[PDB]
User: Which sequence fits this backbone?
């Protein structure tokens, strides 16, 4: 199935996944497309951050869901 | 025309063109309560043409719950006429005035009208006109833990930048005739389908470089297509693409026609079902007002809530809203209707302020069109929340008591906080704390620390400061300014000028931390964040963390024994260029600016420091020979800067700068081309000077070249500064001395190592003048200062960079960009700062409520440039199992007194079921079960502090209050197990 990842700078990434796929797998596909190391990826679905070891189903992520990829900032 | 000294950091976000349009846009703001004054503050700081206020309603005591420009002496006085005085002080370039009457035709004077504290009926009346007369409309309202924003910039609004990102660009390797662009050396283009790109320097396809944009189709991370280019060449080679940003027309609906079919911006995809409920509830709030003479429901009043819920039913039917109303949620808005929280006004006020700039600049994507928000997880649960507890009390905090209650108000007042930083986030944080009444109780207190002083550019987003405060300490001014906002804080704030870190643990020690309720960061660097995080973990203190970058920001809460800490997760590392690229093979202006910054340091800083060390350190030469990475350079600096190249006049400084020109933009280039000729090829037959390597060309000095001349002036003036000689700028003296310059002959040598001994250095050291002959003589080093345009620093870097850009055929950059790069200036402005401060304090009330469920906390992320907000529950701390017990791998530790080694071993066996096999302190091994029995017989009766002192052969520092130890031990099954560290309380 297809899901979308929106970044904090407005980019949209489309992924081909299955509900049984792990977050680690989803992060690997994001690394292929964007070059961001999995450990530096902050993914959010329905107000929850995705953690390694779990699966998309564990977060109710379904066809054409939208995740947010975010970062921390250091100005202030 | 634009004062870059004030607007520096904000210009790096909005740009000159945007601010030029702002300086021609009057703004009208209705309502001067907490929300309106926050919007007006940011807009004034932002630099619009002017701000007009309208709020005849008289000042009530409860208005001071969030409106920080109103004192108790102002009660009864209309809010607009009291607030104008203090808003006019923010930005000298933005006149602020009041208007007593609102005429529909009078609205034609403003490019944007912000409407707050206004009924829906009056809103529709205003928006009907503005929507027809090309006037931007924005309406926001803060109701307890609920907020709403509506934007209507007209049905033909042209947005010229829909994301605020810089245009993408990258080096190309090849282009096929069918249009397949392959990036260079696995370099990602970052484009998306539908983007447009221009080209330059493409070989074999001349027509492609003409600048006509071409829509892109992404084939992969390193490849994309632009369509057929057969009519233009058989094969493209090399070159550079640049993204072409396209504008978009945004058609907004009016408030009247969108009221039926509203378009929502969702701030939380976990609360997707709420904005519809809120759309009805905010309208029902205005119907209640019209029914009860402009009065909102009373705090937590059930009768008023029932009548309110009935209005929602009628409105839901009138609007044909096919939605099942959530009674408990909707009634919660009525209960909190009279809530006035400063955090909510900061959050909404910062966002609305940014939307006002969007309407007046056509930059960034505006909210389209309804933004409904709640922080309902902030509602306390450890205290009774009833109509009796939330009732007004006749104090400045009535707006906050309306939501949290009086019992909760006392908890806020007794907080002991620690604010690390008094800059942008710091100023907004202090303002919030003052309005909330933090630390106004008997046991309450605030500690603020910051080692920096106020500067001009700070005044654009650090609103506690004023131009006359320039040069003073931030922590002191901010403390004083907040005492004026809330006199209850007089004497309750202690300010420090300390740099938080290892060196200041004598001030911020155990005794200091133990008293704190929580720590709040307001920092601008990751190093200080990571340090504060370690300390809060050690002292088991909550930490409120936030950051900004231009229009982006984020928040993170660290809850002891519940969540992970700031340092538990990794961020992308700071970019650093390869040394080979800066040293010899630049291809971007960023490479020449970094090189020029190192040149500035290498001509006017490093050698000066070596001279002064040679004259004040007794054994500097010996130590340097054993430690310096380049001892020959140190010896040559001293020799050159004290005798052989010592100038005696500004004329001699000009001669010196003229020599540096050929040394770094000619002779060095010749030597490079000598080792790598232009036509030389690699091992694969391909031209060496290809791809990232650009063939350089040496420069021939030309006094009539602005870049050549600017380098001579800046370099000569800095060399004179080093020696105290008075510099000059009259071009006649430069022409006089330079016209008679005989350059020494130069020939490229051989055998020089260009990446892609003992006797001479001992002899030149003896040729140095002895420090005995230069008693008291020093040179003045140049300390890089990006924000002083009279010191020639940016002049030298700009000119030096652009001269190197001319060597390598790189496009030069002006001082504005060069200052940004060389200075590592973080783009920032007031809007993002207010937004993070609001989100941070919405989490603060959760910490003081003692919330134990991790799902109630929220980390925040946003980008105001695209109207993106999103939130996530914090990550729980990693757990571990030891003898079946759950151990928190971040927060747990064993607290023991300064007992004996034996007593420690017995404690762990009998109380913890752990057989201590090894005990260590730092690098030192204190105890192990395998040590001989005589080693143990003499150590087991010793105290831990005594055991550490003896093994380390070093006495403990006297002010030490704790001792950190680690142990290896076997669990009850005899198996080795990892366990938390030990903290000895001395
Ligand atoms: N974000 S900002 O640039 O507007 N201001 C940040 C603010 O924080 C202070 N700061 C930076 N580093 C420290 C440490 N280590 N301790 C205390 N304060 C610190 C800066 O001076 C700046 O004013
Ligand atoms: Mg500063
Ligand atoms: Mg800073």
Assistant:
């Amino acid at each position: 199935m297809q899901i979308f990842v929106k970044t904090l700078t407005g980019k949209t990434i489309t992924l081909e996944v299955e509900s049984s796929d792990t977050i680690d797998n989803v992060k690997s596909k994001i690394q292929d497309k964007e070059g961001i190391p999995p450990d530096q990826q902050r993914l959010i679905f329905a107000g929850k951050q995705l953690e390694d070891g779990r699966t998309l189903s564990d977060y109710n992520i379904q066809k054409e869901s939208t995740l947010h990829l975010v970062l921390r900032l250091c100005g202030g | 025309t634009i004062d870059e000294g004030l607007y520096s950091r904000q210009l790096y976000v909005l740009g000159h063109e945007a601010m030029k349009q702002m300086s021609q846009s009057n703004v009208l703001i209705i309502g001067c309560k907490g929300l309106g004054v926050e919007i007006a503050k940011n807009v004034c700081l932002a630099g619009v043409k002017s701000v007009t206020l309208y709020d005849p309603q008289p000042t009530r005591i409860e208005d001071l719950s969030s409106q920080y420009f109103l004192t108790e002496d102002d009660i009864g006085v209309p809010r607009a006429k009291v607030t104008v005085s203090k808003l006019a002080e923010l930005n000298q370039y933005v006149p602020v005035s009041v208007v007593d009457e609102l005429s529909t035709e009078y609205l034609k004077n403003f490019k944007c009208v912000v409407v707050t504290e206004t009924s829906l009926t009056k809103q529709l009346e205003i928006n009907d006109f503005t929507h027809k007369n090309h006037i931007a409309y924005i309406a926001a309202d803060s109701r307890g833990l609920f907020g709403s924003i509506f934007c209507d910039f007209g049905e033909n609004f042209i947005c010229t930048d829909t994301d605020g990102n810089e245009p993408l660009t990258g080096m190309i390797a090849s282009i096929t005739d069918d249009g397949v662009v392959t990036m260079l050396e696995e370099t990602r283009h970052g484009l998306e389908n539908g983007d447009f790109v221009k080209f330059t320097e493409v070989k074999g396809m001349p027509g492609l470089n003409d600048g006509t944009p071409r829509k892109v189709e992404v084939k992969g991370p390193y490849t994309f297509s632009i369509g057929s280019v057969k009519d233009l060449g058989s094969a493209g080679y090399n070159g550079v693409f640049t993204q072409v940003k396209v504008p978009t027309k945004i058609s907004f609906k009016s408030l009247r026609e969108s009221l039926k079919d509203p378009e929502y911006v969702y701030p939380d995809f976990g609360k997707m079902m709420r904005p519809p409920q809120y759309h009805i509830a905010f309208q029902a709030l205005s119907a209640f007002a019209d029914a009860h003479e402009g009065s909102l429901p009373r705090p937590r009043n059930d009768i008023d809530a029932a009548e309110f819920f009935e209005f929602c039913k009628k409105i839901a039917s009138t609007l044909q809203f096919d939605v099942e109303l959530d009674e408990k949620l909707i009634k919660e808005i009525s209960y909190q209707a009279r809530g006035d929280l400063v955090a909510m006004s900061a959050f909404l006020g910062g966002a609305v302020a940014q939307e006002v700039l969007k309407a007046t600049t056509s930059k960034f994507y505006p909210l389209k069109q309804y933004f409904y928000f709640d922080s309902l997880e902030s509602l306390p649960s450890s205290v009774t929340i009833s109509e009796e507890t939330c009732k007004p009390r006749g104090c400045r905090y009535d707006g906050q008591i309306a939501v949290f209650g009086s019992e909760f108000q006392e908890k806020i007042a007794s907080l002991s906080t620690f604010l690390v930083g008094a800059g942008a986030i710091g100023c907004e944080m202090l303002k919030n704390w003052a309005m909330m009444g933090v630390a106004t109780g008997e046991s309450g207190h605030i500690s603020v620390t910051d080692m920096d002083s106020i500067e001009k550019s700070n005044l654009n987003r650090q609103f506690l400061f004023r131009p006359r405060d320039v040069g003073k300490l931030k922590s002191e001014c901010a403390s004083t300014a907040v005492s004026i906002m809330n006199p209850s804080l007089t004497g309750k704030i202690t300010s420090y000028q300390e740099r938080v870190g290892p060196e200041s643990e004598g001030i911020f020690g155990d005794e200091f931390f133990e008293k704190l309720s929580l720590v709040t960061n307001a920092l601008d660097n990751v190093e200080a964040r990571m340090y504060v995080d370690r300390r809060c973990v050690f002292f088991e203190k909550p930490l409120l963390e936030s950051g900004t970058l231009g229009t982006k920001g984020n928040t993170q809460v660290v809850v002891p024994h519940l969540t992970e800490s700031y340092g538990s997760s990794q961020d992308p590392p700071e970019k650093s260029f390869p040394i080979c690229t800066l040293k010899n093979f630049p291809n971007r202006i960023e490479h020449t600016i970094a090189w020029a910054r190192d040149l500035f340091e290498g001509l006017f800083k490093q050698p000066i420091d070596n001279v002064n060390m040679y004259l004040s350190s007794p054994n500097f030469l010996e130590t340097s020979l054993k430690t310096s990475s380049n001892p020959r350079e140190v010896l040559e600096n001293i020799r050159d800067y004290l005798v052989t190249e010592k100038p005696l006049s500004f004329e001699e400084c000009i001669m010196w700068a003229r020599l540096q020109f050929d040394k770094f933009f000619n002779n060095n280039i010749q030597q490079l081309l000598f080792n790598f000729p232009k036509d030389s090829v690699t091992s694969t037959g391909q031209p060496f000077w290809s791809g990232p390597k650009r063939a350089p060309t040496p420069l021939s000095f030309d006094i009539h070249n602005r870049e050549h001349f600017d380098f001579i002036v800046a370099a000569a003036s800095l060399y004179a500064f080093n020696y105290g000689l008075k510099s000059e700028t009259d071009p006649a003296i430069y022409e006089r001395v330079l016209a008679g310059y005989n350059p020494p002959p130069f020939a490229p040598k051989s055998g020089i190592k260009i990446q892609v001994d003992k006797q001479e250095l001992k002899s030149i050291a003896d040729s140095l003048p002895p420090p005995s002959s230069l008693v008291g003589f020093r040179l003045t080093p140049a300390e890089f200062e990006k924000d002083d345009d009279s010191n020639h620093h940016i002049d030298f870097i700009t000119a030096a960079s652009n001269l190197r850009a001319m060597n390598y055929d790189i496009t030069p950059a002006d001082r504005f960009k060069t200052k940004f790069v060389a200075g590592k200036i973080v783009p920032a402005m007031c809007t993002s700062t207010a937004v993070v401060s609001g989100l941070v304090c919405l989490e603060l009330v959760k910490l003081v409520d003692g919330k134990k469920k991790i799902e109630e906390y929220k980390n925040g992320f946003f980008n105001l440039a695209i109207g993106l907000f999103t939130f996530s529950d914090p990550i729980a701390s990693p757990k571990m199992k030891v003898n079946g017990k759950e151990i928190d791998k971040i927060w747990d530790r064993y607290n023991l007194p300064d007992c004996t080694l034996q007593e420690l071993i017995d404690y762990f066996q009998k109380e913890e079921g752990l057989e201590v096999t090894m005990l260590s302190s730092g690098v030192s091994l204190l105890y192990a079960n395998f040590q001989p029995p005589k080693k143990l017989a003499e150590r087991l009766p010793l105290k831990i502090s005594e055991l550490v002192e003896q093994i380390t052969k070093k006495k403990l520092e006297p002010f030490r209050k704790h001792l950190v130890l680690e142990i290896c031990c076997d669990d009850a099954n005899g198996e080795d197990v990892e366990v938390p560290f030990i903290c000895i309380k001395l």
